Amino acid sequence: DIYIPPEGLYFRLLGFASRQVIFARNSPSPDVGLSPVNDQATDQYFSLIYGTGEHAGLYAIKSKATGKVLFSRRPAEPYVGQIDGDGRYPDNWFKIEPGKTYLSKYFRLVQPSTGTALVSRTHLQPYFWNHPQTEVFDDQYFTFLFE
């Protein structure tokens, strides 16, 4: 019962471990990362693109500020970022994987073909990153924050 929004409805992605939201911006560098929940800046907002055909069941994550979609990959560095193209690459496509107990209202964002999960944390850099999906930590959990 994690609500997943339709296309066109905007949200921010809050991390359980970091209490911050993902940003995707034009400038300054870096162009992706984490920023303060309280700011509610446009570059914290995203909407989903629903995958079809080979990406049926997966979602791309499109920035309101830049129009680009998030990627999560290995082994090419850097491991996370944004790019043009509305999900033209396999690493733009995420599975939403709900947690349990205290994470029942959160989920991982797993990019299945590279086998990575997004990370949002405060204890180690990079603060916004990814991790092999097979090894689970609390800081891979996110929740949609809507207006």
Ligand SMILES: OC[C@H]1O[C@@H](O[C@H]2[C@H](O)[C@@H](O)[C@@H](O)O[C@@H]2CO)[C@H](O)[C@@H](O)[C@H]1O
């Ligand atoms: O979904 C991301 C795609 O990235 C492409 O690599 C980009 C790269 O991130 C950027 O820094 C710059 O160097 O241009 C590259 C070419 O667009 C990959 O080629 C593609 O496979 C995806 O990882």
Ligand SMILES: OC[C@H]1O[C@@H](O[C@H]2[C@H](O)[C@@H](O)[C@@H](O)O[C@@H]2CO)[C@H](O)[C@@H](O)[C@H]1O
């Ligand atoms: O879920 C993320 C986990 O990352 C682990 O740290 C990684 C780090 O992100 C990577 O860059 C490299 O240095 O290897 C580390 C070990 O796998 C943290 O140790 C773990 O606490 C999580 O944050």
